[PDB]
Amino acid sequence: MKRTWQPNRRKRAKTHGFRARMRTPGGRKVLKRRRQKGRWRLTPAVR
Amino acid sequence: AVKKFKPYTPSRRFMTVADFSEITKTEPEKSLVKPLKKTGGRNNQGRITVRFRGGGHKRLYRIIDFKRWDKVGIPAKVAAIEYDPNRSARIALLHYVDGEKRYIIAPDGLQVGQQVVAGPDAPIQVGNALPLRFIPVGTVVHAVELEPKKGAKLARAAGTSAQIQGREGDYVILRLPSGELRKVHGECYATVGAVGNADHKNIVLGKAGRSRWLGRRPHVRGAAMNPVDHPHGGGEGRAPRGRPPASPWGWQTKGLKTRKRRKPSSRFIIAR
RNA sequence: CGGUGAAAUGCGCAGAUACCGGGAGGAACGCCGAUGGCGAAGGCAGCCACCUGGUCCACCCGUGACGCUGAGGCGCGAAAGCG
RNA sequence: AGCCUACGGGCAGGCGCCGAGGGUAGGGCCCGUGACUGGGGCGAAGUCGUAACAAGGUAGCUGUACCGGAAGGUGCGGCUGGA
RNA sequence: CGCGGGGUGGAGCAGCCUGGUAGCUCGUCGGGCUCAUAACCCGAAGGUCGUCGGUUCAAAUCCGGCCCCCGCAACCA
RNA sequence: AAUGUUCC
RNA sequence: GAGCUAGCCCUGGCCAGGGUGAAGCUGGGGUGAGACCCAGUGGAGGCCCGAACCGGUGGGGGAUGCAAACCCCUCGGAUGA
RNA sequence: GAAUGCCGGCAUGAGUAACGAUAAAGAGGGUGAGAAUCCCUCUCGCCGUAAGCCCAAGGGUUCCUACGCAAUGGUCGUCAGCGUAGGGUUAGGCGGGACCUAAGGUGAAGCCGAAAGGCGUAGCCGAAGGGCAGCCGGUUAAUAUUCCGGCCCUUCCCGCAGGUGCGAUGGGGGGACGCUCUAGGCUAGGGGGACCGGAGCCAUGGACGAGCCCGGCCAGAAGCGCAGGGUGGGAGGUAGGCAAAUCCGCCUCCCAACAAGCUCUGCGUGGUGGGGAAGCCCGUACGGGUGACAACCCCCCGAAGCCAGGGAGCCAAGAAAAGCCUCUAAGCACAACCUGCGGGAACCCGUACCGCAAACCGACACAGGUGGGCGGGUGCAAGAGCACUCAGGCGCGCGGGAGAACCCUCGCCAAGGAACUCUGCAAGUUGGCCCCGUAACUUCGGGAGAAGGGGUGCUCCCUGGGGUGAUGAGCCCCGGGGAGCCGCAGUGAACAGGCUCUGGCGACUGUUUACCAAAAACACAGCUCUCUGCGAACUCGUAAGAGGAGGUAUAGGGAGCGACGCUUGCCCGGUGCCGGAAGGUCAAGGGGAGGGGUGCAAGCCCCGAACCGAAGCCCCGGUGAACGGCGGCCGUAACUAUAACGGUCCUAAGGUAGCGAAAUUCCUUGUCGGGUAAGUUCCGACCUGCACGAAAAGCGUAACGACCGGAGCGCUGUCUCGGCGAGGG
RNA sequence: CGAUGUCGGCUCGUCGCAUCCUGGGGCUGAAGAAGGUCCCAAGGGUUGGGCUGUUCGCCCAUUAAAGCGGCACGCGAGCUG
Ligand SMILES: [Mg+2]
Ligand SMILES: [Mg+2]
Ligand SMILES: [Mg+2]
Ligand SMILES: [Mg+2]
Ligand SMILES: [Mg+2]
Ligand SMILES: [Mg+2]
Ligand SMILES: [Mg+2]
Ligand SMILES: [Mg+2]
Ligand SMILES: [Mg+2]
Ligand SMILES: [Mg+2]
Ligand SMILES: [Mg+2]
Ligand SMILES: [Mg+2]
Ligand SMILES: [Mg+2]
Ligand SMILES: [Mg+2]
Ligand SMILES: [Mg+2]
Ligand SMILES: [Mg+2]
Ligand SMILES: [Mg+2]
Ligand SMILES: [Mg+2]
Ligand SMILES: [Mg+2]
Ligand SMILES: [Mg+2]
Ligand SMILES: [Mg+2]
Ligand SMILES: [Mg+2]
Ligand SMILES: [Mg+2]
Ligand SMILES: [Mg+2]
Ligand SMILES: [Mg+2]
Ligand SMILES: [Mg+2]
Ligand SMILES: [Mg+2]
Ligand SMILES: [Mg+2]
Ligand SMILES: [Mg+2]
Ligand SMILES: [Mg+2]
Ligand SMILES: [Mg+2]
Ligand SMILES: [Mg+2]
Ligand SMILES: [Mg+2]
Ligand SMILES: [Mg+2]
Ligand SMILES: [Mg+2]
Ligand SMILES: [Mg+2]
Ligand SMILES: [Mg+2]
Ligand SMILES: [Mg+2]
Ligand SMILES: [Mg+2]
Ligand SMILES: [Mg+2]
Ligand SMILES: [Mg+2]
Ligand SMILES: [Mg+2]
Ligand SMILES: [Mg+2]
Ligand SMILES: [Mg+2]
Ligand SMILES: [Mg+2]
Ligand SMILES: [Mg+2]
Ligand SMILES: [Mg+2]
Ligand SMILES: [Mg+2]
Ligand SMILES: [Mg+2]
Ligand SMILES: [Mg+2]
Ligand SMILES: [Mg+2]
Ligand SMILES: [Mg+2]
Ligand SMILES: [Mg+2]
Ligand SMILES: [Mg+2]
Ligand SMILES: [Mg+2]
Ligand SMILES: [Mg+2]
Ligand SMILES: [Mg+2]
Ligand SMILES: [Mg+2]
Ligand SMILES: [Mg+2]
Ligand SMILES: [Mg+2]
Ligand SMILES: [Mg+2]
Ligand SMILES: [Mg+2]
Ligand SMILES: [Mg+2]
Ligand SMILES: [Mg+2]
Ligand SMILES: [Mg+2]
Ligand SMILES: [Mg+2]
Ligand SMILES: [Mg+2]
Ligand SMILES: [Mg+2]
Ligand SMILES: [Mg+2]
Ligand SMILES: [Mg+2]
Ligand SMILES: [Mg+2]
Ligand SMILES: [Mg+2]
Ligand SMILES: [Mg+2]
Ligand SMILES: [Mg+2]
Ligand SMILES: [Mg+2]
Ligand SMILES: [Mg+2]
Ligand SMILES: [Mg+2]
Ligand SMILES: [Mg+2]
Ligand SMILES: [Mg+2]
Ligand SMILES: [Mg+2]
Ligand SMILES: [Mg+2]
Ligand SMILES: [Mg+2]
Ligand SMILES: [Mg+2]
Ligand SMILES: [Mg+2]
Ligand SMILES: [Mg+2]
Ligand SMILES: [Mg+2]
Ligand SMILES: [Mg+2]
Ligand SMILES: [Mg+2]
Ligand SMILES: [Mg+2]
Ligand SMILES: [Mg+2]
Ligand SMILES: [Mg+2]
Ligand SMILES: [Mg+2]
Ligand SMILES: [Mg+2]
Ligand SMILES: [Mg+2]
Ligand SMILES: [Mg+2]
Ligand SMILES: [Mg+2]
Ligand SMILES: [Mg+2]
Ligand SMILES: [Mg+2]
Ligand SMILES: [Mg+2]
Ligand SMILES: [Mg+2]
Ligand SMILES: [Mg+2]
Ligand SMILES: [Mg+2]
Ligand SMILES: [Mg+2]
Ligand SMILES: [Mg+2]
Ligand SMILES: [Mg+2]
Ligand SMILES: [Mg+2]
Ligand SMILES: [Mg+2]
Ligand SMILES: [Mg+2]
Ligand SMILES: [Mg+2]
Ligand SMILES: [Mg+2]
Ligand SMILES: [Mg+2]
Ligand SMILES: [Mg+2]
Ligand SMILES: [Mg+2]
Ligand SMILES: [Mg+2]
Ligand SMILES: [Mg+2]
Ligand SMILES: [Mg+2]
Ligand SMILES: [Mg+2]
Ligand SMILES: [Mg+2]
Ligand SMILES: [Mg+2]
Ligand SMILES: [Mg+2]
Ligand SMILES: [Mg+2]
Ligand SMILES: [Mg+2]
Ligand SMILES: [Mg+2]
Ligand SMILES: [Mg+2]
Ligand SMILES: [Mg+2]
Ligand SMILES: [Mg+2]
Ligand SMILES: [Mg+2]
Ligand SMILES: [Mg+2]
Ligand SMILES: [Mg+2]
Ligand SMILES: [Mg+2]
Ligand SMILES: [Mg+2]
Ligand SMILES: [Mg+2]
Ligand SMILES: [Mg+2]
Ligand SMILES: [Mg+2]
Ligand SMILES: [Mg+2]
Ligand SMILES: [Mg+2]
Ligand SMILES: [Mg+2]
Ligand SMILES: [Mg+2]
Ligand SMILES: [Mg+2]
Ligand SMILES: [Mg+2]
Ligand SMILES: [Mg+2]
Ligand SMILES: [Mg+2]
Ligand SMILES: [Mg+2]
Ligand SMILES: [Mg+2]
Ligand SMILES: [Mg+2]
Ligand SMILES: [Mg+2]
Ligand SMILES: [Mg+2]
Ligand SMILES: [Mg+2]
Ligand SMILES: [Mg+2]
Ligand SMILES: [Mg+2]
Ligand SMILES: [Mg+2]
Ligand SMILES: [Mg+2]
Ligand SMILES: [Mg+2]
Ligand SMILES: [Mg+2]
Ligand SMILES: [Mg+2]
Ligand SMILES: [Mg+2]
Ligand SMILES: [Mg+2]
Ligand SMILES: [Mg+2]
Ligand SMILES: [Mg+2]
Ligand SMILES: [Mg+2]
Ligand SMILES: [Mg+2]
Ligand SMILES: [Mg+2]
Ligand SMILES: [Mg+2]
Ligand SMILES: [Mg+2]
Ligand SMILES: [Mg+2]
Ligand SMILES: [Mg+2]
Ligand SMILES: [Mg+2]
Ligand SMILES: [Mg+2]
Ligand SMILES: [Mg+2]
Ligand SMILES: [Mg+2]
Ligand SMILES: [Mg+2]
Ligand SMILES: [Mg+2]
Ligand SMILES: [Mg+2]
Ligand SMILES: [Mg+2]
Ligand SMILES: [Mg+2]
Ligand SMILES: [Mg+2]
Ligand SMILES: [Mg+2]
Ligand SMILES: [Mg+2]
Ligand SMILES: [Mg+2]
Ligand SMILES: [Mg+2]
Ligand SMILES: [Mg+2]
Ligand SMILES: [Mg+2]
Ligand SMILES: [Mg+2]
Ligand SMILES: [Mg+2]
Ligand SMILES: [Mg+2]
Ligand SMILES: [Mg+2]
Ligand SMILES: [Mg+2]
Ligand SMILES: [Mg+2]
Ligand SMILES: [Mg+2]
Ligand SMILES: [Mg+2]
Ligand SMILES: [Mg+2]
Ligand SMILES: [Mg+2]
């Protein structure tokens, strides 16, 4: 049947995107941990 | 003259539709200082507040002249009687002689092509508007303001009316549709005559979906719920409430008054 | 205080009954009024106005037997009752 | 495809429509019966009350509606078969 | 066989808790009113307190043991 | 302020 | 974290084909005027049968499966909540 | 040495199950070291409202070509969606952005919050919505509405030539809107044709013939023509459109009443341009040449699409903004705007490929899921159904044998026909269309497809309507009548209800436990109670604010009951709710009689009784469609039996109507009656209701039900009681 | 209790005898027939339906008889539910 993942470039960049992170003080801490750890991809890749 | 239906399918033996003969030949609405976009919404910024609103047919908000002191002494010709989905009452298109086109909430007995004017001069004929202090005692009236210069806010549902019972100083005493006796300031405007479409009480919605057409979602009783959701709920089958009857929030719903006691409007109220 | 044959229930020391002044609302219209009138029956009673029916008298003016009753039908139909 | 005495005929034979009745199914009317149940009539001396007839001890009767073991009581309106 | 409550004149109930004396209503009997009955009025009689024991000077009353009556309970797989 | 067995 | 799911807002789309024939019109009839009655027209409906679509009633299979909810037969709704 | 310990490796099961839909394969010839799997040909089978074609999302090189098989491929593999390398995606007109707004997000001013932050008119962002200028062919191995060819357009900028008071983010018009059913005329698509064009064929008994087979088209400015859609024209007066207006609106006179006239679409035709089968010949994976000076004509059906903003009916009353037209103000009128014609300028991104699937979501080449458009023909009444089939695409990435039990999926059966069993669970019967015919009941609609039947093919003859057509032929829809033929059998295959009687429950259509429960549960119109006079009541939030609602007692919130019919009796003693300027109690505070500690003293500092002190509670009342409750014992009648009646105790009051061994009943398979040969179930009664009962509603109720219970008929492998056959294992 | 699936039915049985029938025998208040009771005996057999989920039980129509029990109230890596 219909599974959980029904992808959308529109939704993924607005929910998890970089500009979505910086609006919240929560999301600013999200990147701040990911810079600290050393992620190559701070945000998920949208093309 | 309420239309009945032959019982050709079930829920049409009871289904009941109001008479539309008083609607003159004006089915499309006017524009240009007439409808705004009406935002349908069951809820505030976020969560639901008034539960079980939703659905419903799409509507356009006919903007209504509740404040008819704008055009004192200026007469009007009743152009048309139109349908309003936003209201129980009907609405009357008015062409002013001045040139404006506004709607007034259509009173009872008003016919097409009748002169109508607002102000202090304003002779006592159905549709005209006056201060309350200039209206004779005992006349039925509607669209009454509460405080002056704030808009018509009283007695404007279908077939409603307020009756003047007397004067006292700068205030007049009204018999409201609730039966409450209320002191209202004399300068508050008010439009004489009852509202009409009085047969709106006699409609029978017939089936379930006509409530969904109006925008009324299904309503779930408390005793059909579980006790997390409602006080009445739970219980192995059909418990008889076991407690004084309450809301989902705990406040009782059989006889509990909740008017704010220390309200400054208390000393203008005489009756229930 | 009410109330009865006499009482009691009840109402009242939180201000009752009896009084005056003001306000709301509903129903029925005293005297006139009668052994009266009107209507086919049921029935109809403060007053005003509108609409409207039956009826009686005078003049003997016109039609010219157009009349009487009425199975069914149709309409009215106190009070109580139903939506 | 038979038989015949006159053979562009008849008979035997075949086919078809109608057809008594039988079968299937569903209706109408009537009769008998049916656990139980409603009220009725009759039945020498059963039980409970007093409804009515004298203002029958609340005048009576009545249409309707409600109630009550029971007659009945009460309400609304009517009648004189009462003052 | 668990828990609680009850057995009182002929019928129905008190009085038990705080021991010393058993009362109310109907009924029964006698007499009044009536012509006679019922209603009503005046008198009166009637009770091993379920039994068996024992605590006390003393028991319907306090405590045990049986016999009946009423109510509750008798659940989990 | 209720009532009066059956037939004669 | 509402890209599954529940609800709602804004905007678009979809519903083969058959039936049943409500109101309303028009004509005739009827009456003092009506109510009303016949036809003919008309095409209403959380109407009917039934594909796409939406479901998941009963059974069978499947059970280290094609599948962490499937397949076959059957069945409900299908202009409406 | 053990902790169902951790990590790693290797065993056992075991050469076992499985190899992923039962749509199907066989042969010849190539290439190769190696072919059941790669290529070609021939034959067969499967899809064909797709298993074919075009988009959108998603995926990101998977597309094409060359070299190759270690690994992936459930086998093999020369093959590939795989490895290496090279190539390939071309836009003023397609889609998106230098245009607009909706929900929503953001947010100058402003409001709020310990901080973080939360609201918030205007503005801004925000799209399959609005607006906007391109159609047909041909080329590549891979792109094309993008390149090329033909034809046609749109913006700007600069010039000229002709016109006019021009001129705004401002006013107004317009854009601009539902559902259902429809009219007329077109088009897309399709069918036929003795007519036109065409290579070829006469087979096997017959036919050189109105013979067979294939094909008869697309686009196209101006101009015409055919259908439509839009809008009255003047003259005054004007206080409204937040300044003005010649525009809009309002009022009064005239002329039209129509589309007569302006426009604007659609469709034909149109200068012309392109395409152009079947067969044969070829050499490719795959395309080419000829057929071709190709023909390119006439009928008929005909849309859900177009003219579009068409019409009619109905209630639930059906977006905004910009583009566009007009009107004017600041400014200007050497400016500017409009029209025509020249020349010039016309940017950024996507463009391959799969796209109901082996390239998306499911760890997989997964029998699942995934939005839009085209989706041919014939026949079956119609149709997107069903069967066969064009175009097109596949035979599902393990096979060869054999023909045991057993299993799955099917097919048939004597005689009996539910005896099986919890239960006809399952399977069978019936099934489409047309025409007869159809009950109790009923809310007058229904029940109804009730039930129960009859016909259904082909040939010939006669005959009635329509439509396109000229009133005619033809072509196409509906019919009627009469003769006749064949088969066991005519919706001859496929798709296609078993029915009835009677209970319970729920009124009905609907909804739910994704993933064991679709129901008698939830919802539902409707009934009642209660709250709420607006800055409402209630909800969310600390607040601001917002929902309610741009609503106003015929409205909104909460609660129960759940159409409808007939009804909803008694108790306010306790709890709750409502009303009550008395009283009792009561906190902080007021007040300080008195008393205490210190000081030599004035003083400073503590406790502190009277009394005055709100809500709440006690107290007085009302309130049951508020929470709730609604008795026990004994006697009595002239056969017994029973009790209309009486006594007594208690309560706040002691279950009324209606129903009752029921979805309530323990004893209980209560006792009668019916159905049956036999009935713990069912149906109808009795009432001894352990323990119904009136809005946690009571008693009924036509219709409805994938609910639950009982019975009958029809029919059958459910069974007696098995047997045989087929395909996949 | 780091799991022993529990009623009833279906299929398959097998065993014990304190035997339902058939075989043999004693007594009988056994005339005969048909019975009663008791002993020996299990080799074989022990039906089909209605009701209930039923084991049991009650009936219908039969029969020579329509037996009682054990095997985890036999049997769910065999089925039903
Ligand atoms: Mg505008
Ligand atoms: Mg917001
Ligand atoms: Mg938010
Ligand atoms: Mg509800
Ligand atoms: Mg529940
Ligand atoms: Mg919750
Ligand atoms: Mg709670
Ligand atoms: Mg219960
Ligand atoms: Mg409760
Ligand atoms: Mg004369
Ligand atoms: Mg009357
Ligand atoms: Mg009356
Ligand atoms: Mg002859
Ligand atoms: Mg009879
Ligand atoms: Mg008397
Ligand atoms: Mg009397
Ligand atoms: Mg009397
Ligand atoms: Mg009385
Ligand atoms: Mg009287
Ligand atoms: Mg007198
Ligand atoms: Mg006692
Ligand atoms: Mg006692
Ligand atoms: Mg005596
Ligand atoms: Mg006496
Ligand atoms: Mg437990
Ligand atoms: Mg427990
Ligand atoms: Mg239990
Ligand atoms: Mg007597
Ligand atoms: Mg006597
Ligand atoms: Mg969602
Ligand atoms: Mg239809
Ligand atoms: Mg009609
Ligand atoms: Mg229809
Ligand atoms: Mg329907
Ligand atoms: Mg259907
Ligand atoms: Mg489709
Ligand atoms: Mg669902
Ligand atoms: Mg299923
Ligand atoms: Mg069906
Ligand atoms: Mg180890
Ligand atoms: Mg060790
Ligand atoms: Mg091994
Ligand atoms: Mg082997
Ligand atoms: Mg093995
Ligand atoms: Mg094996
Ligand atoms: Mg195998
Ligand atoms: Mg495979
Ligand atoms: Mg070779
Ligand atoms: Mg095929
Ligand atoms: Mg897209
Ligand atoms: Mg993409
Ligand atoms: Mg992938
Ligand atoms: Mg690659
Ligand atoms: Mg190669
Ligand atoms: Mg390989
Ligand atoms: Mg290599
Ligand atoms: Mg694989
Ligand atoms: Mg391999
Ligand atoms: Mg090779
Ligand atoms: Mg490739
Ligand atoms: Mg490659
Ligand atoms: Mg630019
Ligand atoms: Mg730019
Ligand atoms: Mg845009
Ligand atoms: Mg933009
Ligand atoms: Mg914008
Ligand atoms: Mg906005
Ligand atoms: Mg700040
Ligand atoms: Mg914000
Ligand atoms: Mg767009
Ligand atoms: Mg668009
Ligand atoms: Mg474009
Ligand atoms: Mg391509
Ligand atoms: Mg092209
Ligand atoms: Mg070009
Ligand atoms: Mg402009
Ligand atoms: Mg504008
Ligand atoms: Mg064409
Ligand atoms: Mg054509
Ligand atoms: Mg053709
Ligand atoms: Mg030819
Ligand atoms: Mg030949
Ligand atoms: Mg004009
Ligand atoms: Mg102005
Ligand atoms: Mg015209
Ligand atoms: Mg053309
Ligand atoms: Mg043209
Ligand atoms: Mg060619
Ligand atoms: Mg229109
Ligand atoms: Mg607008
Ligand atoms: Mg704007
Ligand atoms: Mg325009
Ligand atoms: Mg101008
Ligand atoms: Mg491309
Ligand atoms: Mg492409
Ligand atoms: Mg598709
Ligand atoms: Mg995949
Ligand atoms: Mg998976
Ligand atoms: Mg993959
Ligand atoms: Mg595969
Ligand atoms: Mg797949
Ligand atoms: Mg889906
Ligand atoms: Mg789909
Ligand atoms: Mg088609
Ligand atoms: Mg087709
Ligand atoms: Mg045929
Ligand atoms: Mg056809
Ligand atoms: Mg068909
Ligand atoms: Mg189609
Ligand atoms: Mg098909
Ligand atoms: Mg083919
Ligand atoms: Mg395979
Ligand atoms: Mg055969
Ligand atoms: Mg058979
Ligand atoms: Mg047979
Ligand atoms: Mg049979
Ligand atoms: Mg049976
Ligand atoms: Mg059996
Ligand atoms: Mg049974
Ligand atoms: Mg059954
Ligand atoms: Mg079945
Ligand atoms: Mg058949
Ligand atoms: Mg029925
Ligand atoms: Mg009918
Ligand atoms: Mg039939
Ligand atoms: Mg029926
Ligand atoms: Mg034939
Ligand atoms: Mg035509
Ligand atoms: Mg014609
Ligand atoms: Mg035949
Ligand atoms: Mg069939
Ligand atoms: Mg049934
Ligand atoms: Mg039923
Ligand atoms: Mg039952
Ligand atoms: Mg239901
Ligand atoms: Mg009911
Ligand atoms: Mg239905
Ligand atoms: Mg579930
Ligand atoms: Mg679950
Ligand atoms: Mg289910
Ligand atoms: Mg269901
Ligand atoms: Mg109701
Ligand atoms: Mg909030
Ligand atoms: Mg708060
Ligand atoms: Mg607000
Ligand atoms: Mg609002
Ligand atoms: Mg309400
Ligand atoms: Mg409400
Ligand atoms: Mg309910
Ligand atoms: Mg009825
Ligand atoms: Mg009640
Ligand atoms: Mg009470
Ligand atoms: Mg109370
Ligand atoms: Mg009280
Ligand atoms: Mg104090
Ligand atoms: Mg102090
Ligand atoms: Mg107080
Ligand atoms: Mg008594
Ligand atoms: Mg009572
Ligand atoms: Mg009973
Ligand atoms: Mg029987
Ligand atoms: Mg029986
Ligand atoms: Mg019964
Ligand atoms: Mg009970
Ligand atoms: Mg109940
Ligand atoms: Mg109740
Ligand atoms: Mg109910
Ligand atoms: Mg019932
Ligand atoms: Mg029923
Ligand atoms: Mg159902
Ligand atoms: Mg349903
Ligand atoms: Mg049976
Ligand atoms: Mg079998
Ligand atoms: Mg086989
Ligand atoms: Mg254990
Ligand atoms: Mg173990
Ligand atoms: Mg032995
Ligand atoms: Mg023997
Ligand atoms: Mg023997
Ligand atoms: Mg013998
Ligand atoms: Mg013997
Ligand atoms: Mg049976
Ligand atoms: Mg055994
Ligand atoms: Mg045992
Ligand atoms: Mg047992
Ligand atoms: Mg066992
Ligand atoms: Mg099992
Ligand atoms: Mg078992
Ligand atoms: Mg076992
Ligand atoms: Mg085992
Ligand atoms: Mg079960
Ligand atoms: Mg089951």
Residue numbers in the entry:
A (entry chain R7): 1 to 47
B (entry chain RD): 2 to 273
Reproduce the article's own wording on this structure.
Decoding is thought to be governed by a conformational transition in the ribosome—open (off) to closed (on)—that occurs upon codon–anticodon pairing in the A site. Here, we solved crystal structures of 70S ribosomes harboring 16S ram mutations G299A and G347U in the absence A-site tRNA (A-tRNA) and in the presence of a near-cognate anticodon stem-loop (ASL).
There is a slight widening of h14 coupled with the movement of h8 away from h14 prevents formation of the base triple that normally links helices h14 and h8. Interestingly, the electron density map reveals that the substituted nt (U347) is ejected from its usual position in the loop. This remodeling reduces the h14 loop size to three nts, allowing G346 to form basepair interactions with C342. In other words, both 70S-G347U structures exhibit the reduced h14 loop size, regardless of whether cognate or near-cognate tRNA occupies the A site.
